Amino acid sequence: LKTKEEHQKEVQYEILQKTIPTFEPKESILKKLEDIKPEQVKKQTKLFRIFEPRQLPVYRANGEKELRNRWYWKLKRDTLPDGDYDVREYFLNLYDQVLTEMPDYLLLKDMAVENKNSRDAGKVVDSETAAICDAIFQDEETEGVVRRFIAEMRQRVQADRNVVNYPSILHPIDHAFNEYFLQHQLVEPLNNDIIFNYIPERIRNDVNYILNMDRNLPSTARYIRPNLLQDRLNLHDNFESLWDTITTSNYILARSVVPDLKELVSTEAQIQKMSQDLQLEALTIQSETQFLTGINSQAANDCFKTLIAAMLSQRTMSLDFVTTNYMSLISGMWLLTVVPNDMFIRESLVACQLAIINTIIYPAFGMQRMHYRNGDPQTPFQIAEQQIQNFQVANWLHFVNNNQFRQVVIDGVLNQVLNDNIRNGHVVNQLMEALMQLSRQQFPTMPVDYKRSIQRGILLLSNRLGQLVDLTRLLAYNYETLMACITMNMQHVQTLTTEKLQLTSVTSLCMLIGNATVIPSPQTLFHYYNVNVNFHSNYNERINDAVAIITAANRLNLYQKKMKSIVEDFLKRLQIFDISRVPDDQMYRLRDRLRLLPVEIRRLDIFNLILMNMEQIERASDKIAQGVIIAYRDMQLERDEMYGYVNIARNLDGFQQINLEELMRTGDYAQITNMLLNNQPVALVGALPFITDSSVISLVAKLDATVFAQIVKLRKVDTLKPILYKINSDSNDFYLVANYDWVPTSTTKVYKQIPQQFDFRASMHMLTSNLTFTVYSDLLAFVSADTVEPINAVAFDNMRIMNEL
Amino acid sequence: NSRDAGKVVDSETAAICDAIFQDEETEGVVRRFIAEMRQRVQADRNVVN
Amino acid sequence: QFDFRASMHMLTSNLTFTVYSDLLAFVSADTVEPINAVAFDNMRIMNEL
């Protein structure tokens, strides 16, 4: 029947597991935490430039080409898209690019090309900075006050005060961009008082671990501080499936750190003695050879690691036992008096507390069997704490009812700490007195054969007093000295899946321990710290990057952008989750809580520096124009200095504006067809391309007004391309404008701008940075740590742990 | 064809949304109504519309 | 007739369930040692010699 009950059991446990985002090989997560690199230091090799100077031909008032050319600020890489939604999506891809290009520290001495025109030794700050300077000197059009200056300009390096300034030639948009990487550094000075503070206070004030600093740090040593603040997304109150991963992933790491026991009692001498005191053959017992199956040397090290690592990461822990086997139930009395009661799941704490009372305690004192109802607020150790009439047993039942974790805030973080009576090991001196008097009780109805074997199974634990006080002084010290290096917050809720603890193998710990104390090694204790800081600083550097995109997509008015794709990329870079098992209920709570957080200070001043200049980069591009204006009347072409005769628009004043972005979303073409079927003046607003046709006969034939009929025939607006007349001297058929008596006119014109000229006095400035840094990555490679000899290891009081020697 | 990338509830519902949008005789009031057709997800109480 | 703006409806339901077909696969029961098996009166059954 067991193949039918188990394949029905294992098909319901699979439905729950497909909503938990942990990995199905459990021990695979340990590689995924120990490989998280802290950060990347980024030194910029070259300056950040958007604009560049160029030469463009300049024409006269009438169409004659002039010899002297002028320097304009036309930008490089003018690959701007088409349409106002595709333009505002391009600037998000610029802001997402600058955040990875942004340096933490920017030195300036290693980026300096010499100025080949200076009288003395002159140096400029980039290769492009020297490239503009030699183009201005040899060109004769510049004033002599500019030509004498670029030879007389000179840097000032000071190696004593560790500063240096260098000249530059930059656009004002790049000047505001390069200053922000240069004024707001990330590096902070480092000395021996910071490494002595980066170590935790509970290990620095410990007696066993001696900590000395044996390396000299220079005066110019900098470091980057880890961002360790608590979780602004409270992932433990309503995310009942996303917290089970973080609790599992912090439990597998803490099993690889806690040391394994050494020098145990020999397992062939204990079982051969334990089988003599119980006398299992003479009883009426079905499981004769099954009482002593779990006593092992490989299963005592498991319940020492399971009991600590499910206590450092607040992981629930069920019980697995057989209520027939009373020896695995007496060793369940020690588990409850030490491990706090809120750790176990309630249905497995009640099922263990009921089996202890209804088999061992209440048959001893001669009371009735405890009728217990499962829908009760009182655990069975709280009901029999009053109905029992002893004092040794009614005082042990009062401690096990009232041991939990007492929350306290040490050095910034909250951590669940045990009470003072368990860390002292003194409680087992009370459990010995509650278990010795229960061994003298006559079991007034039990058969004499079964009573005499449950009185000698008790005296196998009451006679082990000196080496069981010496256990819980060590079990509460390994947890206490590993809790010091916990950077994340130690919150406590009930998880969904539980790590099963077997009470058969807790029996293998209480009577196989010896007088050999083990403490965590200082190289182990400094590695469990550096994994926890590298994961907690990575958890706060993805929240700040997922908020700064979700917010910046909402300021730019980007509809049809799936915000769920950003949360899946936030959960992916947190290297312990997978995405294919997260429920869709908790992906819309994670988007609800990520919008309410404020954006980080250094990721906001970059976005405010783009949104202020988003219209200056869009208008300065070629191959794009910000709308066409139809007039349906004659208007003369104004003359320009870089296009000759041109139809440009300086403002959309007086004319009714129709947004071509909104006209594409809705599809309502009832107005713009009615404006075009009649002859009514209108102004289309958008980001359109254009064709630049210099033909004079293309103006007499009036080819400008014929391109708008495609809007009426077919409902698409993407195929709009107005013409832009550029009548120069180089355009043939120019003799009509010169010789004949007529002014050039066009029905429509186009909205466009003229690029900013090159002024020398506003394009140069001096950039001031430092001379030499040294950025160190890890800090606990300077502290050289050694432990004391393990025999002389002392607890929080100076009496030593494991004092049976 | 919506203002933002929404989700209608059936494949037959989206088939008679595209059949009226791509006609040449559908008036602009109905063609403006299909663009304003998206879903609303609430995560406090787990309901969608 | 078919009018588009008056024939739509805003259908609603939950986001996520997780249904379970067998409930007694979650609990796991065992029995107290059969010498100490207790009848409706609190003395045991089969106690005599």
Automatic annotation (TrEMBL), chain B:
Site positions for Interaction with the intermediate capsid protein VP6: 33, 37
Subcellular location: Virion
Signal peptide region: none
PTM entry text: Sumoylated with SUMO1 and SUMO2. Sumoylation of viral proteins seems to have a positive role on viral replication.
Subunit structure comment from the entry: Homodecamer; each decamer is made up of two conformers of VP2, called VP2A and VP2B. Interacts with a VP1-VP3 complex. Interacts with the intermediate capsid protein VP6. Interacts with NSP5. Interacts (via N-terminus) with NSP2.
Its job: Inner capsid protein that self-assembles to form an icosahedral capsid with a T=2 symmetry, which consists of 120 copies of VP2, with channels at each of its five-fold vertices. This capsid constitutes the innermost concentric layer of the viral mature particle. It encapsidates the polymerase VP1, the capping enzyme VP3 and the genomic dsRNA, thereby defining the core.
Family note: Belongs to the rotavirus VP2 family.
Description of its domains: The N-terminus binds RNA. It is necessary for encapsidation of VP1 and VP3. The N-termini of 10 VP2 molecules form a cylindrical hub underneath each 5-fold axis of the inner capsid.
Protein name as catalogued: Inner capsid protein VP2
Gene this chain is encoded by: VP2
Residues of the full protein shown: 199 to 247 of 887
